[PDB]
């Protein structure tokens, strides 16, 4: 294949594995940063049936009441659509700090993610939500009016337009008073010169963008003029509201397995075969990059057969992963032993800074020490016919050193003291 049209998450891994700029939006180029040309910006939205309800629900808690009144369903197989509920309560794929993604920190195991997933499985068990439904069945149900609401992107709108049923698009409802944070995908083209020029001066045009959008709605197009002439449509406005409420998808190569992991967790979470915490732990273990297949399988089995120590298992797996990657509390605690004299305190803190991974040991034995706990060097020069040499002793003053040196001379068969070099010289 020459060019691939897809969301911007996988092009980063593809690149890892091997005036025109001003014509598009800057964040679109920044997201694909260059490896791909942005074409469309897509975000999920809540599409409801106008005849079913006058106004959409604002909170996720009210949706079960409306559904049981009907007696909500969408694509459950793909994590993409279910992710906003998880991300609403603090769930994040990777820690985005000072503009950089921290692969070492993964927030899928957060408590808010647990609350979102347990609310989803509560919807599943109450028969309000279908665990085995997919995108096609959800589209068919919304086209036939079986479901009052659905979660879908711009592309399905034309298909809904084929069903001629009145549909209203809006922002996804808030979860526990917190708005959702859907992933914002950038549908862009990645090249495996003629194809590049055909993308540039033919596809990236108002006529080309409008021709593509007529077949299937691209949502937010990267081209400025078509965005300006298409911003009048309120559906695009709702899509951008969802986008700013959401977070852009990362470009790091660590997403694909991540997606796989999340998918498995959702498949574990929806079917009821495993609890929310165990599914999240399995997803976290699958996310971990440097674990060997045998090690990952062993950790998976250990999490499966005993969920009591899941936190300790995750900590040990993270430690092993950091060890195979190609203390501050201890620092504060060590300084606070009162009876410990200064010398061993520096020794222990030097060991702590020297080897962090032994800190849990180094702290503990220090406590085992704590309960247990609770001078000038002068030189003699003998210039004698019977004894020639020099020796040293540590003393608090020249007087104690003088007695010590005189005793040493007494056991060994004119005394002068040079204070500048702290030297007693004895001449026989």
């Amino acid at each position: 294949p020459d060019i691939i049209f897809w969301a911007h998450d996988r092009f980063g891994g593809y690149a890892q594995s091997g005036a025109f700029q001003d014509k598009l939006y800057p964040f679109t180029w920044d997201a694909v940063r260059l490896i791909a040309y942005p074409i469309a910006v897509e975000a999920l939205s809540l599409i409801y049936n106008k005849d079913l309800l006058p106004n959409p629900p604002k909170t996720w808690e009210e949706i079960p009441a409306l559904d049981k009144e009907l007696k909500l369903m969408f694509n459950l197989q793909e994590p993409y659509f279910t992710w906003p509920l998880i991300a609403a309560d603090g769930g994040y794929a990777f820690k985005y700090e000072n503009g950089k993604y921290d692969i070492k920190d993964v927030g899928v195991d957060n408590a808010g993610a647990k609350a979102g997933l347990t609310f989803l499985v509560d919807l599943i068990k109450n028969k309000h939500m279908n665990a085995d439904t997919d995108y096609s069945i959800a589209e068919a149900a919304f086209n036939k009016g079986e479901t009052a609401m659905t979660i879908n992107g711009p592309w399905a709108w034309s298909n809904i337009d084929t069903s001629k049923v009145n549909y209203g698009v809006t922002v996804l409802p808030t979860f526990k008073g917190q708005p959702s944070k859907p992933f914002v995908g950038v549908l862009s083209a990645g090249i495996n010169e003629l194809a590049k020029e055909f993308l540039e001066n033919y596809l990236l045009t108002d006529e080309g963008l409008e021709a593509v959008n007529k077949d299937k709605p691209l949502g937010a197009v990267a081209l400025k003029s078509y965005e300006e002439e298409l911003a009048k449509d309120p559906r695009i406005a709702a899509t951008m509201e969802n986008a700013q409420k959401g977070e852009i998808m990362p470009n790091i190569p660590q997403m694909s397995a991540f997606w796989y992991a999340v998918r498995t967790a959702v498949i574990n979470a929806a079917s009821g075969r495993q609890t929310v915490d165990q599914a999240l732990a399995f997803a976290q273990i699958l996310i971990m990059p440097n674990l060997t297949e045998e090690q990952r399988n062993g950790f998976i089995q250990s999490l499966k057969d005993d969920p009591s120590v899941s936190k300790e298992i995750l900590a040990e797996a993270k430690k092993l992963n950091e060890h195979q990657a190609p203390q501050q509390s201890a620092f504060y605690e060590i300084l606070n032993m009162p009876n410990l004299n200064e010398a061993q305190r520096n020794g222990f803190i030097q060991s702590l800074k020297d080897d962090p991974s032994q800190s849990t040991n180094v702290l503990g034995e220090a406590k085992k020490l704590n309960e247990s706990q609770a001078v000038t060097t002068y030189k003699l020069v003998i210039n004698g016919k019977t004894l020639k040499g020099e020796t040293t002793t540590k003393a608090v003053d020249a007087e104690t050193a003088e007695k010590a040196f005189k005793q040493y001379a007494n056991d060994n068969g004119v005394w002068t003291y040079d204070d500048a070099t702290k030297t007693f010289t004895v001449t026989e």
């Epitope: 060890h323 080897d355 991974s357 032994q358």
Partner: antibody
């Protein structure tokens, strides 16, 4: 010729701390793992500590676990062993030894040993 | 760890004939993939650092005289000196380096005359 020379030994009171240094010459110090091994007249040879080439893997003896710390400075070609909370049973002579490359493929054990520094602990 | 026990605490002998020093392991130290027994024999002259004599319990280290030979398997390993020389008085340690690192109790070799 490979030369390993240790320093820092002496007499220290029980419960104190002591740092031993070992300087290596004649080989790429930044590529070979290092061992600290102590010997006493009444107990004999035993292995105390081991540090890998890139300091990513470190192992300690059973009786010195949590008390001793091993490290190395590759740019300075030095190997450091810090002992804290010393006890009277630690009076021994310490050597720094080299671990040959890929002993799981060729089987060469600890080959080059230093002279050794004598550490004695007493009141 | 795997500690080793050397049978002779000390042995005296005249120069010219053979001596055998044996040592026992608590468990097999044979690496499965290599099919090589991970054990070494070290010699330590008085007032000197230990010197490597034999590795893999059969292979002879570079520069080691042909008199020194290693044999044995399972849990029993023997070091044999075919012709003991006067400057061969030292302490011999058998040492495993498969799991952790441990050294034998030490066998002292004396010279009779």
């Amino acid at each position: 010729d490979v030369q390993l020379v240790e320093s820092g030994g002496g007499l220290v009171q029980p419960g104190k701390s002591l740092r031993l240094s070992c300087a290596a010459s004649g080989f790429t110090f930044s590529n070979f793992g290092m061992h600290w091994v102590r010997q006493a007249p009444e107990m004999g040879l035993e292995w105390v500590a081991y540090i890998s080439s890139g300091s990513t893997t470190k192992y300690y003896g059973d009786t010195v676990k949590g008390r001793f710390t091993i490290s190395r400075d590759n740019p300075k070609n030095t190997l450091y062993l810090q002992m804290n909370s010393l006890r009277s049973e630690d009076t021994a002579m310490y050597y720094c030894a080299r671990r040959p490359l890929y002993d799981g493929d060729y089987g060469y054990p600890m080959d080059y040993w230093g002279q050794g520094t004598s550490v004695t602990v007493s009141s | 760890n795997i500690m080793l026990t050397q049978s002779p605490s000390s042995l005296a002998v005249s120069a010219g004939e053979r001596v055998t020093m044996s040592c026992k392991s608590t468990q097999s130290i044979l690496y499965n993939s290599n099919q090589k027994t991970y054990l070494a024999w070290y010699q330590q002259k008085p007032g000197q650092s230990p010197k490597l004599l034999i590795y893999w319990a059969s292979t002879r280290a570079s520069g080691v005289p042909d008199r020194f030979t290693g044999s044995g398997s399972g849990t029993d390993f023997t070091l044999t000196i075919n012709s003991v020389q006067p400057e061969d008085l030292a302490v011999y340690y058998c040492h495993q380096y498969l799991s952790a690192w441990t050294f034998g109790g030490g066998t002292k070799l004396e010279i009779k005359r």
